[PDB]
Design a protein around this nucleic acid. Structure first.
Lengths: 58, 206, 146, 64
RNA sequence: GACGACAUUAGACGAAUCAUCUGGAAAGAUGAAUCAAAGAAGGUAAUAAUCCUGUAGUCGAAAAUGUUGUCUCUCUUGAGUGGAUCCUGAGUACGACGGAGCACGUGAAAUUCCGUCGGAAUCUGGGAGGACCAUCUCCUAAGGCUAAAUACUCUCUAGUGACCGAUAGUGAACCAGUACCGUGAGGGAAAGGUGAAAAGCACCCCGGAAGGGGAGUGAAAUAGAACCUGAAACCGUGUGCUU
RNA sequence: GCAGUAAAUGUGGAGCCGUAGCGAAAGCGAGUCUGAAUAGGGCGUUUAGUAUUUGGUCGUAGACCCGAAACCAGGUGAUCU
RNA sequence: CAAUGGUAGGAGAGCGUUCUAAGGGCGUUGAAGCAUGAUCGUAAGGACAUGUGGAGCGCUUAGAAGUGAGAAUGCCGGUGU
């Protein structure tokens, strides 16, 4: 589930508690399905909302 | 002090003066022994090893249950008591070499060269001059010099023909003046040093 | 000495004590470890400093102090160690390093005052104590601090 | 491998010249209203590790 | 592409010993010799420098390869001085939240990364010097490539071992990951030795045969193929002394 | 590290220990710290260390041998039930 | 002249097994093993003779260790009751 522009993908880490008890967690990108111009012909693909902050044409 | 220089024939030519701080000290048998042990230990390529209970093939299943059978409790078919099992504490690959202080290494070469100069086993010859390898001629030289079955010949630097000539005479080893070692001087019952090697060995070892 | 008659230095070698080989050796059955408890087990014993659950010494006691990451500590040369030089002779840190009285200039050279000169000479080091100053000036000779 | 040092102890003892270890004192953090003025300056000092404990912890501080 | 250069995937030459004794056979013993740039090693009817294969030394490729000297070949600008303007890596640095990493526990984390929101400067600039700043010093991010020293051995080649010598050493010296076990993953053995030479016992006798007993082979056949030595437990047959 | 033969050995003097200790430290020095003290008291000061090695222990390693109930990861199995 | 029971345990001296270095030796005119014997030392143990056996093995000094078994409901193999 990667972005077709930036590459922002998910990542693992730890959910830590008040007693520093650790559990594995994940962090996903704010991936949104948008119809952009892939090689001319329009196509729907996942793109991050930071890549849409400035620069992408829907 | 003054040792007679003979020709390869055995007839006296001149006389040289080797110091008593190198070829006339009182031998330290405690230092010479430790130096012989060191050299003989340093020569051990210990490459000897066995397999313990982790390196024997298989052996992972508890061979039978712990209780109920009437047998002794066992945990692997590769335990030390089992035929075919791991060895407890046997040989492991290791080295055997150690070191001694530098000054002690020098008192051991001097002590061995002084034992072989108190027992009258140091024949200083002038030069060697072998112009081609021939063994029958090196046997004639050592017999005309009346040297024991076991002799160590010392040249100045590498003398190719003297070396190729004494390689097969059984009981003779050829060594440069810098490659003198205790195990070799102490096996040799007699020495034959070139006058140039004799002045070099006095400079280096004292 | 011959290679087939050699002897080791007297009292320099000793045969080690093999354990668990017969009763006659005196360490036969239990191998000198007593009968039971942790001491009698393989890999047994207790970690050093442990006190059976009693609060160990080094937690009964408080820590104190710090470390001044930058210390100026010098290789010290005593007064009497300077009488291996000669009279009038102009010693320097390099000269005494050559003489070997100081195995390394650590962060400078400091002259302290223990013995006597028996001499008259000038010096040049990094720091001096008072006693060094009066001891040099009494016999005569300067001390140019660098 | 190279033997380690009890870092918890290296912060509590300074090594002295005859091989003793100078330690700080106990009973000196709080509750001073319950201890006498005599107890306090006689605790404002330094003692030496007792030989019995030295036999116990010789190796924990070998590199000090 | 086009010439050479050593090396490697066949190989070649290679010194010098005879006699007696004991023996089934000598390499042993004894005597007399010899060679050695070769007295490394393995064979040989016993323990061989001189019997054999070799060894030191030297020589050697049709070919097919790694490798390397060159000759080509293919590429191709090198500086200074001004410096007025211009340019020098953006959703980036960096901040906030939450995590990881760095000997150092969202923390000072400065150094550094990831997710989520924000979000800069363009030399008259930007970053770092362990909260940190001011000054000093150093550097110039956010594009890319880069051999050597370094790690390892399924192999191949040569060799070494105060390493094991068949309950050891590989599980496996021997048709072994095989008998066998399990539906399967898997688990997994036991088992080398006649003699120098097979000379492996022509014939005869008892017996259906297995065996045996002569004769013969051999130094030896309680070395006859389950075969070198052949212990103990255990099983027998005699008996001297006892009950 | 280099030479050397998988050796001795030679070279290599970064470092390492000692010759000065005291104090948390700045720092001072046969003294130093506390303290106003030139008081008292603590630790020092009366040189002997270092390199290698035999032996005895201890640490880190599975560390004298055998032996759990069990935990976790990746696979195999509904031909019995 | 005195001392000498001894378990956990400390100390010391030693006997043995394999291998290595050197020296010196023994071996088909019979090595190592194996069996027997009425032999020697304070002990661990060491020889000698005679049989089987058909090729290696002692001794001195010194080095190293997979060095010494009677018990672990030990493992493997044989054979009992």
């Amino acid at each position: 589930k990667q972005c077709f522009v930036t590459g922002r993908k998910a990542s693992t880490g730890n959910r830590r508690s008040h007693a520093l008890n650790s559990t594995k967690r994940r962090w996903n990108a704010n991936l949104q399905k948008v119809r952009i111009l892939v090689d001319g012909k329009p196509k729907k693909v996942w793109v991050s909302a930071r890549a849409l902050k400035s620069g992408k044409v829907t | 002090a003054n040792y007679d220089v003979l020709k390869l024939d055995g007839t006296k030519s001149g006389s040289i003066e080797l110091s008593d701080a190198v070829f006339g000290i009182e031998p330290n048998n405690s230092v010479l022994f430790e130096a012989i042990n060191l050299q003989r230990a340093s020569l051990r390529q210990g490459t000897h090893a066995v397999k313990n209970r982790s390196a024997v093939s298989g052996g992972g299943r508890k061979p039978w249950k712990q209780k109920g059978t009437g047998r002794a409790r066992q945990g692997t078919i590769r335990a030390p008591q089992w035929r075919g099992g791991g060895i407890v504490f046997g040989p492991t690959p290791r080295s055997y070499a150690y070191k001694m202080p530098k000054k002690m290494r020098r008192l051991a070469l001097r002590s061995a060269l002084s034992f072989k100069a108190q027992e009258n086993g140091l024949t200083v010859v002038d030069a060697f001059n072998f112009e081609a390898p021939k063994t029958k001629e090196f046997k004639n030289v050592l017999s005309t010099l009346e040297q024991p079955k076991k002799v160590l010949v010392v040249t100045e630097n590498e003398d190719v023909n003297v070396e190729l000539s004494a390689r097969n005479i059984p009981g003779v080893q050829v060594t440069t003046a810098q490659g003198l070692n205790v195990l070799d001087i102490t096996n040799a019952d007699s020495l034959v040093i070139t006058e140039a090697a004799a002045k070099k060995v006095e400079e280096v070892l004292g | 000495m011959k290679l087939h008659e050699l002897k080791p230095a007297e009292g320099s070698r000793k045969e080690r004590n093999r354990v668990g080989r017969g009763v006659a050796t005196g360490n036969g059955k239990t191998s000198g470890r007593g009968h039971k408890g942790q001491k009698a087990r393989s890999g047994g014993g207790v970690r050093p400093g442990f006190e059976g659950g009693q609060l160990p010494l080094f937690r009964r006691l408080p820590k104190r102090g710090f470390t001044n990451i930058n210390r100026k500590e010098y290789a010290i040369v005593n007064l009497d160690q300077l009488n291996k030089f000669e009279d009038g002779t102009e010693v320097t840190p390099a000269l005494l390093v050559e003489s070997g009285v100081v195995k390394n200039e650590k962060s400078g050279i400091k002259i302290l005052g223990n013995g006597s000169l028996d001499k008259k000479l000038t010096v040049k080091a990094h720091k001096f104590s008072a006693s060094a100053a009066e001891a040099i000036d009494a016999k005569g000779g300067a001390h140019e601090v660098i | 491998p190279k033997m380690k040092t009890h870092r918890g102890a290296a912060k509590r003892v300074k090594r002295t010249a005859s091989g003793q270890l100078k330690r700080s004192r106990a009973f000196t953090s709080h509750l001073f209203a319950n201890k006498s003025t005599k107890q306090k300056r006689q605790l404002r000092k330094a003692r030496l590790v007792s030989k019995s404990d030295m036999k116990r912890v010789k190796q924990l501080l070998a590199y000090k």
